[PDB]
Amino acid sequence: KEKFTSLSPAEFFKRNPELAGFPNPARALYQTVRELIENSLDATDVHGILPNIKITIDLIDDARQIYKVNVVDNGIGIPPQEVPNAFGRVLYSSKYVNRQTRGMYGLGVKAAVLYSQMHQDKPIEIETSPVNSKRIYTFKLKIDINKNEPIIVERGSVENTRGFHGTSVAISIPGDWPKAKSRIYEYIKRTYIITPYAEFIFKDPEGNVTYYPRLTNKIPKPPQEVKPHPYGVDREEIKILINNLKRDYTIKEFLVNEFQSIGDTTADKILELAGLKPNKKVKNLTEEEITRLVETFKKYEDFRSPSADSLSVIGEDLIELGLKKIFNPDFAASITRKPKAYQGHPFIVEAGVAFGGSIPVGEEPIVLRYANKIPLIYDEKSDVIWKVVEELDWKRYGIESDQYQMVVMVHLCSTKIPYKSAGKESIAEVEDIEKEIKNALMEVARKLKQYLSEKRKEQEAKKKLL
Amino acid sequence: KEKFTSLSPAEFFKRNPELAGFPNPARALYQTVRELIENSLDATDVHGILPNIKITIDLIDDARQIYKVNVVDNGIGIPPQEVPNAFGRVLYSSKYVNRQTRGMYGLGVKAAVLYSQMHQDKPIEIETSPVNSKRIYTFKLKIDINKNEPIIVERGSVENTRGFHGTSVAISIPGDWPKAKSRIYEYIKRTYIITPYAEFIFKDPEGNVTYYPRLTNKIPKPPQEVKPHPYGVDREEIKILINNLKRDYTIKEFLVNEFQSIGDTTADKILELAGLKPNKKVKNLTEEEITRLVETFKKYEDFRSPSADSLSVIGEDLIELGLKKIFNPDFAASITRKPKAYQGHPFIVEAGVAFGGSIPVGEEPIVLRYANKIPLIYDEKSDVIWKVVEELDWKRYGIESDQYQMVVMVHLCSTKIPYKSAGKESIAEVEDIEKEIKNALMEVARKLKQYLSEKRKEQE
Ligand SMILES: Nc1ncnc2c1ncn2[C@@H]1O[C@H](COP(=O)(O)OP(=O)(O)O)[C@@H](O)[C@H]1O
Ligand SMILES: Nc1ncnc2c1ncn2[C@@H]1O[C@H](COP(=O)(O)OP(=O)(O)O)[C@@H](O)[C@H]1O
Ligand code: ALF
Ligand code: ALF
Ligand SMILES: [Mg+2]
Ligand SMILES: [Mg+2]
Ligand SMILES: [Mg+2]
């Protein structure tokens, strides 16, 4: 006999930790480190703070292979009333607002906590002080998995006599340092290369310390919350927008006020195409009217692009700088494309190419993938970026031979990155994004083609001297 | 200022449908089809019913590219009181018990419903008639994503005069038939090849109808609920086993009764290793004692394997038959390995190899992945199976040229397949599973080596 039951979100990820990027102790150790670093970065640069991040990993128990990961930052901290749910309630986040941040699910640190409880018995340790806080608040926490709620094992407070702000998080988990080492270092290095306004200190389980110095004191304009672009906004999103209204808007007012890229004239045209009365109260839209609006948004070809301003890009200068620093190529080029939209979300693709020099020889490019300023490391061959790179005919762009020295970099940034998994690491096959990654790659490949054509012309001239 | 909020499980998957295997209309059309087929199979062969499954896809709106997918089965149906939550509450399942079924998350059909709701306005339609039912119970449903609760648009019943028993589900979604066509047909074909006791009818949007007739009326022994194997059972799972006890067991009694592969002699050895009192009441285990138990389980080297009868395999004969039917090779061999355990879950790897004949020449093996009797189609290169196949040195097993005609098939079955995502198209990197996949592949590769050795000698 079939017996029907429900799960809490915590039970769901406890039963299936592989879904959150915790399938084995090597990947788990890596995942915990990056989840904490991403939280610390979102807590600093999103708020105009030059990040100073300290990461330590200690082997606590050799026989059991338990490691303690501690990440300390100079971020905005967390209000003490929010700490228990922030670290101990699955699907709880400050990043569900429409804004480019590394975090997005309200899952990552809880998944590390669940993994922690599944395999050892020490609670997670949080110390935090909000900006201008008179106290440093401390917590020891577990998750009641059935209830999906925090258990406060311990809480305290101490006088903040040094005016410190930020957060320390320490979590004890199974790990495999030897297997995870190269990917943890690659993660931090690739973060650092595109984040020169940050400083990192990293102490590993072998007691090695690496220092990654701040190279610039200029911080990018922090991304902020924005209204959706109408292209690809769906029926449920329309309902959300309507339900959130404090005013009794007409449909016309709703269009101009709740979206980017809609003025009076665009609103009039959308209303005409969708068969909607400008003056009807939007709270009264029917199910079928909502469909018509969503379809109209989808097929409308005259929308202005989203503002480049919901997003934070790496930028052509830095992309090129970083490719040169790491690979010492004969040639490098990059492009930061103009903003597009997919499913209501502004996005930008940036692309870079490096060729020759110290880049090793192979039969395929080295592909460097980033999403919202996070370097992607695992699962590359199923990423949509890899799909696009593989499908491009490099013979069209001057790559004559089967063996060559090329690096290709792609950064996607958006108010929402569509990952294939909650562990992130790879980007899903979304058609508008796929198309724009291709256009961007084609644009830099054209700069490569020019470089290779000039080299070829020189060679041809030299050939005549023979 | 940072504003902290919560999401319901419905809101989570509506915001991130890519996580459930709904990233674009082509994959979504495919995913909807397979989620429904897998639901129908779990409702039939798990209950000793020879599955009779009909799949129809109709293009209902050309301009908007909206398709209606209807799957009809002869399964056990759903109790009418359970239908609204079964189809309209995210994280609600009958497959949370420890048992080999295709389904596992309590999400799949709800994810299709969310995708349906995001893009069009017709509700999902369910008709169901459990065994002996004199009525067919009908529903139209939506999901209130904020509450994660069903919305009942219609609900009723008619007398069951034609003796329908089973379930019909129809759902309208955006799709891309031209792009999904080959993978949908591949999915049904590979399911049929390993499920000869099932009968399928497929009507596609172009009006093609394909019949896949039943070839045998002998169903495999249905998979049942089973006890965990102690190796890799975690601390939270120990707590659950303790909370579920209906008697005041000692730790010793706990070990013998609640786990596979622990007889009283093994229990004595574990209690000694873990430093636990045999006669202590298990409800009194401290946090630290649970840790020691779990570590002891992980390190104990003389556990017997779990019972093979826990799981439902394809079997060597059927694997080889299937390979021969698809590829017409010169050589085929297969192995159904003895059971292993990972994270407290029994699993079996089966592996097949085919060489030569009508297999095309290429630079790598054709790799056929299956998990809990489902053919995997997307994301092959990120799959742990692919990792093992790729990392194997085929030169050690007779493949000398860079070009060659080889098919490799791997089936993993378990009380739990660890997928990389809830879209269930690739298996995660779990080391016990990776190791056993390699071991199984090596075993069949040895048979290949033998074939290739004799073939090489004959060439002169
Ligand atoms: N180091 C930190 N500093 C400030 N806030 C943090 C920090 N770590 C976590 N948070 C807060 O806790 C919330 C939950 O964190 P997490 O589970 O990692 O989810 P996510 O980062 O995807 O939102 C975050 O949205 C953020 O508001
Ligand atoms: N065709 C059907 N026949 C019988 N039961 C079904 C059918 N479809 C769905 N169910 C039931 O509804 C539950 C929820 O289905 P689903 O969301 O697909 O989750 P899952 O299959 O992963 O458990 C299933 O666990 C099963 O009990
Ligand atoms: F912790 Al996250 F998306 F960054 F769940
Ligand atoms: F429908 Al499922 F796991 F099979 F959510
Ligand atoms: Mg996070
Ligand atoms: Mg299902
Ligand atoms: Mg199961």
Q: Is B110 annotated among the ligand-binding residues?
A: yes
Q: Which of B257-261's residues contact partners 24+ apart within 8 Å by CB, and which partners?
A: B258/B227, B258/B228, B259/B227, B259/B228, B259/B229, B259/B230, B259/B233, B260/B226, B260/B227, B260/B228, B260/B229, B260/B230, B260/B306, B260/B307, B260/B310, B260/B346, B261/B229, B261/B230, B261/B303, B261/B304, B261/B305, B261/B306
CB contact B273 to A (< 8 Å)? no
Q: Are A377 and A425 in contact (CB under 8 A)?
A: yes
* Helical H segments across A68-215, by residue range: 83-88, 108-119, 177-194
d(CA B389, CA B400): 16
Residues 228-257 of A with CB under 8 A from B: 234-237
Q: Is A105 annotated among the ligand-binding residues?
A: yes
Q: Is A108 annotated among the ligand-binding residues?
A: yes
* Cβ-based contacts of A94 with chain B (< 8 Å): 2-5
Q: Are B369 and B376 in contact (CB under 8 A)?
A: yes
* Cβ-based contacts of B344 with chain A (< 8 Å): none
Residue length of chain A: 466
Task: Mark the residues whose beta carbon lies below 5 A from ion ligand 7.
Answer: B 104, 415
Pairing state of beta strands A406-414 and A366-371? parallel
d(CA B343, CA B232): 4
| Structure-block tokens of residue B13 | 């998957």
Q: Give strand pairing partners of A86.
A: none
Residue length of chain B: 460
Q: Do B118 and A420 touch (CB under 8 A)?
A: no
Q: Do A4 and B82 touch (CB under 8 A)?
A: yes
Q: Do B430 and A4 touch (CB under 8 A)?
A: no
d(CA A193, CA A321): 9
Instruction: Tell me the CA–centroid distance for residue A15 and ligand 7, in Å.
Output: 10
Contact residues for B435 (Cβ-Cβ < 8 A; gap 6+): none
Residue B192 burial (CB count, 10 A): 20
Chain B residue with Cα closest to A131 = B1
CB contact B6 to A (< 8 Å)? yes
Handedness of CA B344, B345, B350, B351 (dihedral sign): negative
The residue type of A430 is: V
Give whole-number Cα distances, A152 to A85, A235, B32, in Å: 10, 40, 42
Q: Where are the beta strands (DSSP E) in A90-198?
A: 92-93, 124-129, 135-144, 149-159, 166-174
The residue type of B427 is: I
Domains of chain B: 1-217 (3.30.565.10), 227-304 (1.10.8.50), 312-460 (3.30.230.10)
* Best mutation site among A34, A45, A49, A93 for ligand 1 pocket (most ligand atoms within 8 Å of CB): A93
d(CA B90, CA B74): 25
* Helical H segments across B130-176, by residue range: none
d(CA A143, CA A124): 10
* Helical H segments across A195-315, by residue range: 235-243, 251-258, 264-274, 287-299
Burial B67-84 (b: 16+ CB within 10 A, else e): bbbbbbbbbbbbebebbb
Interface test with A, best of B14, B15, B18, B291 (most A CBs within 10 A): B18
Is A106 touching ligand 3 by the criterion CB < 6 Å?
A: yes
Nearest to B23 among A114, A288, A418 (CB): A418
Q: Are A200 and A41 in contact (CB under 8 A)?
A: no
Resolution (A): 2.0
Place of tokens 């008639």: B129
| Structure-block tokens of residue B117 | 């709701």
| Structure-block tokens of residue A97 | 């607002």
d(CA B334, CA B317): 8
Burial B346-383 (b: 16+ CB within 10 A, else e): bbbbbbbbbbbeebeeeeebebbbbbbbbbbbbbbebb
Pairing state of beta strands A331-336 and A135-144? unpaired
Contact residues for A266 (Cβ-Cβ < 8 A; gap 6+): A255, A302, A303, A304
Q: Is B356 annotated among the ligand-binding residues?
A: no
Q: Of B209, B387, B409, B395, which Cα lies nearest the Cα of B327?
A: B409
Q: Do A27 and B429 touch (CB under 8 A)?
A: yes
State phi, psi for A321 to the nearest 5 degrees: -50, -45
CB contact A422 to B (< 8 Å)? yes
Terminal C-alpha separation, chain A: 86
Q: Pick the residue whose CA is nearest to atom 25 on ligand 2.
A: B93
DSSP characters over A421-454: STT-SSB---HHHHHHHHHHHHHHHHHHHHHHHH
Classified as helix, coil or strand, A73 is strand
Pairing state of beta strands B209-212 and B199-203? antiparallel
DSSP characters over B401-428: SSSB-EEEEEEEEES---BSSTT--SB-
Q: Is A465 annotated among the ligand-binding residues?
A: no
DSSP characters over B84-126: HHHHHSSSEES--SSS--S--SS-HHHHHHHHHHHH--PPEEE
Nearest to A9 among B9, B114, B118 (CB): B9
Pairing state of beta strands A66-73 and A52-61? antiparallel
Q: Are A405 and A412 in contact (CB under 8 A)?
A: no
* Cβ-based contacts of B99 with chain A (< 8 Å): none
Instruction: Tell me the CA–centroid distance for residue A371 and ligand 7, in Å.
Output: 34
Ligand 1 atom closest to the Cα of residue A107 is: 17
Instruction: Tell me the CA–centroid distance for residue A118 and ligand 2, in Å.
Output: 28
d(CA B331, CA B324): 8
**How was it solved?**
X-ray
Is B167 touching ligand 2 by the criterion CB < 6 Å?
A: yes
d(CA A71, CA A57): 9
d(CA B11, CA A106): 12
Backbone dihedral region of B415: left (phi > 0), alpha (psi from -120 to 50 degrees) or beta? alpha
Handedness of CA A93, A98, A103, A105 (dihedral sign): positive
Residues 99-158 of A with CB under 8 A from B: 105-106, 114, 117-121, 145
